[model samples]
Target: MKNNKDMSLEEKNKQLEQQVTYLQAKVAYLEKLDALIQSKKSPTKKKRK
Candidate 1:
Protein backbone atom coordinates (compact mmCIF):
# COMPACT_ATOMS: atom_id res chain seq x y z
CA MET A 1 0.00 0.00 0.00
CA LYS A 2 1.15 3.53 -0.67
CA ASN A 3 2.07 5.73 2.25
CA ASN A 4 -0.75 7.92 3.57
CA LYS A 5 1.55 10.61 4.94
CA ASP A 6 0.19 13.20 2.51
CA MET A 7 -3.45 12.52 3.41
CA SER A 8 -5.26 14.18 6.28
CA LEU A 9 -6.33 12.05 9.25
CA GLU A 10 -9.98 12.06 8.16
CA GLU A 11 -9.03 10.96 4.63
CA LYS A 12 -6.96 8.09 5.96
CA ASN A 13 -9.84 6.92 8.16
CA LYS A 14 -12.24 7.09 5.23
CA GLN A 15 -9.94 4.96 3.10
CA LEU A 16 -9.57 2.37 5.84
CA GLU A 17 -13.35 2.26 6.38
CA GLN A 18 -13.94 1.50 2.73
CA GLN A 19 -11.47 -1.34 2.81
CA VAL A 20 -13.20 -2.81 5.89
CA THR A 21 -16.64 -2.66 4.30
CA TYR A 22 -15.43 -4.41 1.14
CA LEU A 23 -13.70 -7.15 3.10
CA GLN A 24 -16.83 -7.78 5.20
CA ALA A 25 -18.99 -8.10 2.08
CA LYS A 26 -16.57 -10.62 0.59
CA VAL A 27 -16.64 -12.71 3.74
CA ALA A 28 -20.44 -12.78 3.82
CA TYR A 29 -20.57 -13.94 0.20
CA LEU A 30 -18.13 -16.75 0.85
CA GLU A 31 -20.05 -17.89 3.90
CA LYS A 32 -23.33 -18.07 1.98
CA LEU A 33 -21.69 -20.02 -0.86
CA ASP A 34 -20.27 -22.51 1.60
CA ALA A 35 -23.68 -23.09 3.17
CA LEU A 36 -25.25 -23.75 -0.21
CA ILE A 37 -22.57 -26.28 -1.10
CA GLN A 38 -22.98 -28.05 2.19
CA SER A 39 -26.74 -28.31 1.73
CA LYS A 40 -26.22 -29.93 -1.69
CA LYS A 41 -23.86 -32.52 -0.27
CA SER A 42 -26.55 -34.11 1.88
CA PRO A 43 -29.03 -36.31 0.06
CA THR A 44 -32.71 -35.36 0.16
CA LYS A 45 -35.68 -37.67 -0.02
CA LYS A 46 -37.34 -37.88 -3.40
CA LYS A 47 -41.02 -37.33 -3.92
CA ARG A 48 -43.28 -39.95 -5.60
CA LYS A 49 -43.45 -39.54 -9.38
Candidate 2:
Protein backbone atom coordinates (compact mmCIF):
# COMPACT_ATOMS: atom_id res chain seq x y z
CA MET A 1 0.00 0.00 0.00
CA LYS A 2 1.11 3.60 -0.71
CA ASN A 3 0.66 6.81 1.35
CA ASN A 4 1.16 9.58 -1.15
CA LYS A 5 -2.24 11.10 -0.47
CA ASP A 6 -1.33 12.01 3.13
CA MET A 7 2.10 13.38 2.35
CA SER A 8 2.53 17.12 1.71
CA LEU A 9 3.63 18.52 -1.64
CA GLU A 10 7.17 19.19 -0.47
CA GLU A 11 7.52 15.67 0.86
CA LYS A 12 6.29 14.24 -2.38
CA ASN A 13 8.64 16.41 -4.39
CA LYS A 14 11.63 15.33 -2.28
CA GLN A 15 10.70 11.69 -2.70
CA LEU A 16 10.39 12.12 -6.46
CA GLU A 17 13.77 13.84 -6.64
CA GLN A 18 15.45 10.96 -4.80
CA GLN A 19 13.74 8.56 -7.20
CA VAL A 20 15.23 10.50 -10.13
CA THR A 21 18.75 10.01 -8.74
CA TYR A 22 18.20 6.27 -8.24
CA LEU A 23 16.93 5.90 -11.79
CA GLN A 24 19.91 7.82 -13.15
CA ALA A 25 22.32 5.50 -11.35
CA LYS A 26 20.48 2.47 -12.72
CA VAL A 27 20.70 3.83 -16.25
CA ALA A 28 24.40 4.49 -15.89
CA TYR A 29 24.99 0.94 -14.69
CA LEU A 30 23.13 -0.49 -17.68
CA GLU A 31 24.96 1.80 -20.08
CA LYS A 32 28.33 0.64 -18.75
CA LEU A 33 27.32 -3.01 -19.23
CA ASP A 34 26.18 -2.39 -22.78
CA ALA A 35 29.38 -0.58 -23.60
CA LEU A 36 31.41 -3.47 -22.24
CA ILE A 37 29.50 -6.00 -24.32
CA GLN A 38 29.82 -3.92 -27.47
CA SER A 39 33.56 -3.41 -27.03
CA LYS A 40 34.18 -7.09 -26.39
CA LYS A 41 31.99 -8.39 -29.18
CA SER A 42 32.50 -5.91 -32.01
CA PRO A 43 36.11 -4.64 -32.12
CA THR A 44 36.60 -6.20 -35.56
CA LYS A 45 34.42 -7.54 -38.41
CA LYS A 46 31.19 -9.41 -37.65
CA LYS A 47 32.90 -12.73 -36.98
CA ARG A 48 30.34 -14.79 -35.09
CA LYS A 49 32.67 -17.17 -33.42
Candidate 3:
Protein backbone atom coordinates (compact mmCIF):
# COMPACT_ATOMS: atom_id res chain seq x y z
CA MET A 1 0.00 0.00 0.00
CA LYS A 2 2.93 2.32 0.43
CA ASN A 3 3.33 2.57 -3.34
CA ASN A 4 -0.03 1.26 -4.52
CA LYS A 5 -0.15 3.75 -7.37
CA ASP A 6 3.25 2.56 -8.56
CA MET A 7 2.26 -1.11 -8.57
CA SER A 8 2.14 -2.98 -11.88
CA LEU A 9 -1.20 -4.17 -13.31
CA GLU A 10 -0.38 -7.78 -12.43
CA GLU A 11 0.19 -6.89 -8.79
CA LYS A 12 -3.16 -5.13 -8.55
CA ASN A 13 -4.91 -8.14 -10.11
CA LYS A 14 -3.26 -10.52 -7.66
CA GLN A 15 -4.40 -8.41 -4.71
CA LEU A 16 -7.97 -8.39 -6.01
CA GLU A 17 -7.92 -12.17 -6.34
CA GLN A 18 -6.76 -12.48 -2.76
CA GLN A 19 -9.61 -10.25 -1.63
CA VAL A 20 -12.12 -12.49 -3.41
CA THR A 21 -10.85 -15.54 -1.55
CA TYR A 22 -10.96 -13.77 1.83
CA LEU A 23 -14.53 -12.59 1.28
CA GLN A 24 -15.72 -16.07 0.23
CA ALA A 25 -14.41 -17.69 3.45
CA LYS A 26 -16.08 -15.10 5.70
CA VAL A 27 -19.43 -15.43 3.97
CA ALA A 28 -19.43 -19.22 4.32
CA TYR A 29 -18.60 -18.95 8.03
CA LEU A 30 -21.38 -16.43 8.73
CA GLU A 31 -23.98 -18.45 6.88
CA LYS A 32 -23.32 -21.55 8.99
CA LEU A 33 -23.34 -19.55 12.23
CA ASP A 34 -26.64 -17.88 11.42
CA ALA A 35 -28.34 -21.19 10.63
CA LEU A 36 -27.22 -22.80 13.89
CA ILE A 37 -28.34 -19.83 15.97
CA GLN A 38 -31.76 -19.68 14.34
CA SER A 39 -32.33 -23.36 14.99
CA LYS A 40 -31.52 -23.01 18.70
CA LYS A 41 -33.91 -20.08 19.16
CA SER A 42 -36.85 -21.96 17.68
CA PRO A 43 -38.85 -24.78 19.27
CA THR A 44 -38.75 -27.13 16.29
CA LYS A 45 -35.96 -28.25 14.01
CA LYS A 46 -35.23 -26.12 10.97
CA LYS A 47 -37.39 -27.42 8.16
CA ARG A 48 -35.85 -28.06 4.78
CA LYS A 49 -37.75 -26.99 1.72
Candidate 4:
Protein backbone atom coordinates (compact mmCIF):
# COMPACT_ATOMS: atom_id res chain seq x y z
CA MET A 1 0.00 0.00 0.00
CA LYS A 2 1.24 3.47 -0.80
CA ASN A 3 1.54 5.62 2.30
CA ASN A 4 0.01 9.06 2.12
CA LYS A 5 0.42 10.02 5.73
CA ASP A 6 2.64 12.96 4.84
CA MET A 7 0.29 14.41 2.27
CA SER A 8 -1.98 17.44 2.79
CA LEU A 9 -5.71 16.83 3.21
CA GLU A 10 -6.55 17.56 -0.40
CA GLU A 11 -3.67 15.52 -1.63
CA LYS A 12 -4.58 12.78 0.80
CA ASN A 13 -8.12 12.63 -0.55
CA LYS A 14 -6.81 12.25 -4.07
CA GLN A 15 -4.33 9.67 -2.95
CA LEU A 16 -7.04 7.84 -1.08
CA GLU A 17 -9.11 7.62 -4.24
CA GLN A 18 -6.14 6.09 -6.01
CA GLN A 19 -5.65 3.81 -3.06
CA VAL A 20 -9.23 2.60 -3.43
CA THR A 21 -8.46 1.52 -6.95
CA TYR A 22 -5.26 -0.12 -5.84
CA LEU A 23 -7.04 -1.95 -3.04
CA GLN A 24 -9.83 -3.14 -5.31
CA ALA A 25 -7.33 -4.61 -7.69
CA LYS A 26 -5.52 -6.17 -4.77
CA VAL A 27 -8.75 -7.73 -3.57
CA ALA A 28 -9.43 -9.20 -6.99
CA TYR A 29 -5.94 -10.60 -7.11
CA LEU A 30 -6.40 -12.20 -3.71
CA GLU A 31 -9.78 -13.65 -4.65
CA LYS A 32 -8.27 -15.20 -7.73
CA LEU A 33 -5.46 -16.57 -5.61
CA ASP A 34 -7.97 -18.12 -3.25
CA ALA A 35 -9.96 -19.64 -6.09
CA LEU A 36 -6.87 -21.18 -7.58
CA ILE A 37 -5.79 -22.59 -4.24
CA GLN A 38 -9.24 -23.89 -3.43
CA SER A 39 -9.30 -25.73 -6.73
CA LYS A 40 -6.15 -27.60 -5.69
CA LYS A 41 -4.25 -26.09 -8.55
CA SER A 42 -0.97 -24.25 -8.80
CA PRO A 43 -1.56 -20.87 -10.35
CA THR A 44 1.88 -20.67 -11.89
CA LYS A 45 1.60 -24.09 -13.41
CA LYS A 46 -1.93 -23.44 -14.60
CA LYS A 47 -0.79 -20.34 -16.42
CA ARG A 48 2.46 -21.74 -17.70
CA LYS A 49 1.31 -24.97 -19.32
Candidate 5:
Protein backbone atom coordinates (compact mmCIF):
# COMPACT_ATOMS: atom_id res chain seq x y z
CA MET A 1 0.00 0.00 0.00
CA LYS A 2 2.98 2.30 0.41
CA ASN A 3 3.31 2.71 -3.40
CA ASN A 4 -0.40 2.17 -4.07
CA LYS A 5 -1.06 5.54 -5.73
CA ASP A 6 1.55 4.85 -8.41
CA MET A 7 -0.11 1.61 -9.51
CA SER A 8 -1.97 1.15 -12.78
CA LEU A 9 -5.76 1.16 -12.76
CA GLU A 10 -5.96 -2.62 -13.00
CA GLU A 11 -3.49 -3.06 -10.19
CA LYS A 12 -5.35 -0.50 -8.12
CA ASN A 13 -8.56 -2.34 -8.64
CA LYS A 14 -6.90 -5.57 -7.63
CA GLN A 15 -5.62 -3.87 -4.52
CA LEU A 16 -9.08 -2.58 -3.76
CA GLU A 17 -10.51 -6.04 -4.18
CA GLN A 18 -7.95 -7.40 -1.75
CA GLN A 19 -8.83 -4.65 0.71
CA VAL A 20 -12.50 -5.43 0.38
CA THR A 21 -11.86 -9.14 0.96
CA TYR A 22 -9.83 -8.38 4.07
CA LEU A 23 -12.45 -5.96 5.36
CA GLN A 24 -15.21 -8.49 4.82
CA ALA A 25 -13.32 -11.10 6.79
CA LYS A 26 -12.67 -8.58 9.57
CA VAL A 27 -16.33 -7.65 9.68
CA ALA A 28 -17.33 -11.28 9.87
CA TYR A 29 -14.97 -11.87 12.78
CA LEU A 30 -16.31 -8.81 14.60
CA GLU A 31 -19.85 -9.95 14.02
CA LYS A 32 -19.08 -13.35 15.49
CA LEU A 33 -17.48 -11.72 18.50
CA ASP A 34 -20.45 -9.45 18.92
CA ALA A 35 -22.76 -12.45 18.87
CA LEU A 36 -20.72 -14.18 21.55
CA ILE A 37 -20.82 -11.05 23.70
CA GLN A 38 -24.55 -10.69 23.31
CA SER A 39 -25.19 -14.33 24.10
CA LYS A 40 -23.06 -14.09 27.23
CA LYS A 41 -24.88 -10.97 28.42
CA SER A 42 -28.36 -12.41 27.91
CA PRO A 43 -30.01 -14.87 30.28
CA THR A 44 -30.37 -18.36 28.92
CA LYS A 45 -33.80 -19.87 28.50
CA LYS A 46 -34.66 -22.84 30.73
CA LYS A 47 -35.27 -26.19 29.08
CA ARG A 48 -37.51 -29.05 30.19
CA LYS A 49 -35.62 -31.99 31.63
Candidate 6:
Protein backbone atom coordinates (compact mmCIF):
# COMPACT_ATOMS: atom_id res chain seq x y z
CA MET A 1 0.00 0.00 0.00
CA LYS A 2 1.68 3.14 -1.22
CA ASN A 3 0.69 6.37 0.45
CA ASN A 4 0.13 9.55 -1.53
CA LYS A 5 3.08 11.19 0.19
CA ASP A 6 5.34 8.48 -1.24
CA MET A 7 4.08 9.01 -4.79
CA SER A 8 4.68 11.76 -7.34
CA LEU A 9 1.81 14.12 -8.10
CA GLU A 10 1.11 12.45 -11.42
CA GLU A 11 1.15 9.02 -9.85
CA LYS A 12 -1.19 10.13 -7.05
CA ASN A 13 -3.68 11.59 -9.49
CA LYS A 14 -3.62 8.48 -11.68
CA GLN A 15 -4.16 6.20 -8.70
CA LEU A 16 -7.10 8.26 -7.46
CA GLU A 17 -8.69 8.26 -10.90
CA GLN A 18 -8.30 4.50 -11.22
CA GLN A 19 -9.88 3.95 -7.81
CA VAL A 20 -12.83 6.19 -8.72
CA THR A 21 -13.44 4.25 -11.91
CA TYR A 22 -13.22 0.90 -10.13
CA LEU A 23 -15.65 1.96 -7.38
CA GLN A 24 -18.14 3.27 -9.94
CA ALA A 25 -18.16 -0.03 -11.80
CA LYS A 26 -18.47 -2.04 -8.57
CA VAL A 27 -21.50 0.00 -7.45
CA ALA A 28 -23.21 -0.55 -10.78
CA TYR A 29 -22.62 -4.30 -10.63
CA LEU A 30 -23.92 -4.63 -7.04
CA GLU A 31 -27.06 -2.66 -7.86
CA LYS A 32 -27.80 -4.98 -10.76
CA LEU A 33 -27.33 -8.01 -8.52
CA ASP A 34 -29.68 -6.56 -5.89
CA ALA A 35 -32.36 -6.02 -8.51
CA LEU A 36 -32.05 -9.57 -9.75
CA ILE A 37 -32.34 -11.00 -6.22
CA GLN A 38 -35.44 -8.95 -5.54
CA SER A 39 -37.07 -10.04 -8.79
CA LYS A 40 -36.44 -13.71 -8.00
CA LYS A 41 -37.83 -13.38 -4.47
CA SER A 42 -41.05 -11.84 -5.77
CA PRO A 43 -41.72 -14.82 -8.03
CA THR A 44 -40.91 -17.32 -5.29
CA LYS A 45 -43.45 -15.72 -2.95
CA LYS A 46 -46.13 -15.95 -5.60
CA LYS A 47 -45.43 -19.64 -6.11
CA ARG A 48 -46.10 -20.46 -2.43
CA LYS A 49 -49.88 -20.22 -3.01
lDDT tens digits by residue: candidate 6, 1-49 = 3324433223322246767663454344333442122323322344554
lDDT of 3 by residue, 1-49 (tens): 2224343223322246767753454344333442122323424577798
Model 2, 1-49: lDDT tens per residue? 2324443223322246766763444344333442122323434677788
| Residue pairs whose backbone atoms clash in candidate 4 | none
What is the model-wide C-alpha lDDT for candidate 1?
A: 0.39
| TM-score of model 1 vs. true structure | 0.22
The per-residue C-alpha lDDT of model 3 at residue 15 equals 43
TM-score of each: 0.22, 0.22, 0.22, 0.23, 0.22, 0.23
Error of 4 at 2 (Å): 17
| Residue 20, candidate 3: alpha-carbon lDDT | 73
Give the Cα error of residue 6 in candidate 2, in Å.
32
lDDT of candidate model 5 versus the reference = 0.39
Poorest 10 consecutive residues by lDDT, candidate 3: 33-42
Can you write out model 4's per-residue Cα lDDT over 1-49, one digit (the tens) per residue?
Answer: 3334443223222245666763444444334342112324334544544
lDDT winner between candidates 1 and 4: 1
TM-score attained by model 3: 0.22
- Residue 48 displacement (Å), model 3: 40
By how many angstroms RMSD does model 4 differ from the true structure? Answer: 11.2
Give the clashing pairs for model 5. Answer: none
| CA lDDT of each prediction against the hidden true structure | 0.39, 0.39, 0.38, 0.38, 0.39, 0.37
Candidate 3, superposed: residue stretches over 4 Å from native: 1-15, 29-49
lDDT, candidate 5, at 11:
32
Give the C-alpha miss distance for residue 34 in model 3, angstroms: 14
